Amino acid sequence: AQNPNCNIMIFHPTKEEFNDFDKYIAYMESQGAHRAGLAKIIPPKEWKARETYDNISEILIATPLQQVASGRAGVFTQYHKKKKAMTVGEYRHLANSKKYQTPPHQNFEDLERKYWKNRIYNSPIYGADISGSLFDENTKQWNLGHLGTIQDLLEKECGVVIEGVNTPYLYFGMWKTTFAWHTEDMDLYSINYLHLGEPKTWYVVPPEHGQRLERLARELFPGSSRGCGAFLRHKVALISPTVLKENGIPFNRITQEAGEFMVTFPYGYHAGFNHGFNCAEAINFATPRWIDYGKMASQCSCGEARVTFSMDAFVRILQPERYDLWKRGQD
Numbered sequence: 001a002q003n004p005n006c007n008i009m010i011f012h013p014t015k016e017e018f019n020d021f022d023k024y025i026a027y028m029e030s031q032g033a034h035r036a037g038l039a040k041i042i043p044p045k046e047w048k049a050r051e052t053y054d055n056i057s058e059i060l061i062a063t064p065l066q067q068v069a070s071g072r073a074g075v076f077t078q079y080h081k082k083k084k085a086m087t088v089g090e091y092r093h094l095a096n097s098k099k100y101q102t103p104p105h106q107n108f109e110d111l112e113r114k115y116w117k118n119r120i121y122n123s124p125i126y127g128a129d130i131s132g133s134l135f136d137e138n139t140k141q142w143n144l145g146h147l148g149t150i151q152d153l154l155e156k157e158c159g160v161v162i163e164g165v166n167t168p169y170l171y172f173g174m175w176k177t178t179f180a181w182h183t184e185d186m187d188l189y190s191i192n193y194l195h196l197g198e199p200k201t202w203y204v205v206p207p208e209h210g211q212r213l214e215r216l217a218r219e220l221f222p223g224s225s226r227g228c229g230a231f232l233r234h235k236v237a238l239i240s241p242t243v244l245k246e247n248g249i250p251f252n253r254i255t256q257e258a259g260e261f262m263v264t265f266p267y268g269y270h271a272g273f274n275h276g277f278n279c280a281e282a283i284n285f286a287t288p289r290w291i292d293y294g295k296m297a298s299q300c301s302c303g304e305a306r307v308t309f310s311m312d313a314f315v316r317i318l319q320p321e322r323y324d325l326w327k328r329g330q331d
Ligand SMILES: O=C(O)CNC(=O)C(=O)O
Pocket: 171, 178, 179, 190, 191, 192, 264, 270, 280, 282, 283
């Protein structure tokens, strides 16, 4: 078995290997990359996502989210308070202000220490989940707006034609903005490109060990667990690396820098934080190997998780027993 310790792997494809996206994912899996839950892909030196980022300031963040924490430094939840609209130029100025800017630090490990010590005492503002793309239309390789769709994959594998669409999302971050512990909708893959700015640190649990994280989460968040049998689908719970180590949960960590891709694999729990002002683009995708994970994915039916239009068909076809209850949660 390849990669039996489930380490995060880093790949350096050549420009020739960068042509065929599906083929390269399958290659990475042949080397055991999926066992980690997360992989890094450094694009060939010839490649670029677009020519410059000089003209992005007028993008609108219609609903910036202030991420307010509750709990203790290593075990907390966050809720999202909606703020008034602002442009990317206005948000960048805010990120750089004395109130929100990255503190002085020695290196990424020092900044990580400071994040876990101090996150809960601040409420950073995240421009998340903005439909759109920063890839130039002429970028033909690893263009996250030109991937094969999940609906087409389901149709190719299973023969069933379904409604729905699959488009990318932009994320504008600042220091301390946080992504809570989660797997993707329907335990899909994700791919995330850091277009510009400061890094993003990731934590990940190997897919084969995801239920260990779920059992810890039920212990640490006992009211939430009584409320919902899949409350990590709410995307609000944080657990620090120190607490994971104290409870024996297997995990790994890595920092993504501008110009780098990350891929999350089916049922790879992940969480993380931004170092400073940045912009990322991400989208879900599927392969043949996902179908079995989609059939087994947990679902939130309590009403909290509320998701896209296109998840309806995935539940309806892959999980017809669960469909009626899940749809009630959506309505
Ligand atoms: O960058 C973020 O805030 C969160 N991204 C992801 O969870 C992802 O790409 O799967």
